[PDB]
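ERR on first pass: missing label on line 2. Operator R.T. fixed the label and resubmitted. Corrected input:
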Amino acid sequence: TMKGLDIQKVAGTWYSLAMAASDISLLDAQSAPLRVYVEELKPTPEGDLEILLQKWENGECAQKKIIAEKTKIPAVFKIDALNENKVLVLDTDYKKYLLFCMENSAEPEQSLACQCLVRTPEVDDEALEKFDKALKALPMHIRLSFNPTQLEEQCHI
Amino acid sequence: TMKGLDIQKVAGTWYSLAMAASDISLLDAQSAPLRVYVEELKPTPEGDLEILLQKWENGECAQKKIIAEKTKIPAVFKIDALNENKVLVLDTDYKKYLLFCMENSAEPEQSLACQCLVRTPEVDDEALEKFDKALKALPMHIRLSFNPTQLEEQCHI
Ligand SMILES: [Zn+2]
Ligand SMILES: [Zn+2]
Ligand SMILES: [Zn+2]
Ligand SMILES: [Zn+2]
Ligand SMILES: [Zn+2]
Ligand SMILES: [Zn+2]
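pass 2 clean. output:
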């Protein structure tokens, strides 16, 4: 988990370039439970974190606003959404990429999903290498990526 | 492509441990067109290669045989497959792992799919690292990894 995280500097728009998870079924279908496309991060003054993302539901992408609550580890947040209860920030440079995981701490290998976010819509090979470097110590069995045209196509339905 | 490959040596039982493809839709469900699980390679006296595999098609785990005809490259075979034209053997050591891709000469990008095969139904980190470096240049938007108790389950789950 990240040390020295300044949550306020992650604010603004983001794109889901890649995602990976501990169980194939968490991401394989367009309707899979952790297939989510992050659009905005909105930190609060108190230091909580609003996550704005799109999820497929009943034929259409739908916006979800997930309130991530501050905890005693600065880069760990508590949630009650998507059947997860934690959001972990692994690393970011604030201006280019951000790596975050979600999991259900009660069954982590059934529930862990990590994403590589980028600030701009392009395939950033260096951000992906950082992502893959973070992932090799995690029990991932599926990894997906989306170029900018593919990402927009996910909700162009 | 591997060079000085000895087809007779690859004969015998194998298990599909990991899979990767250019297009998510080639592998993202059991029903997906290139989700195949290889059971046995059967080299012919004539230098061809019969490939036995399972494929979940309707409600079944269909058993399927594909005949891969020799070409004037020892590591490339012609098939008419699922909708693929070639099987390319990239690397092997006969008794641990074998790496192969399938593609269509007509439109390879929307058709490339590769697999890491192992002889024992064990997760083998060394085979998987060979696979990853074999593929680090290719634009694969889906990569899948199976566990020990999927390796021997019919159509892996
Ligand atoms: Zn709060
Ligand atoms: Zn468990
Ligand atoms: Zn590149
Ligand atoms: Zn595992
Ligand atoms: Zn629509
Ligand atoms: Zn022949």
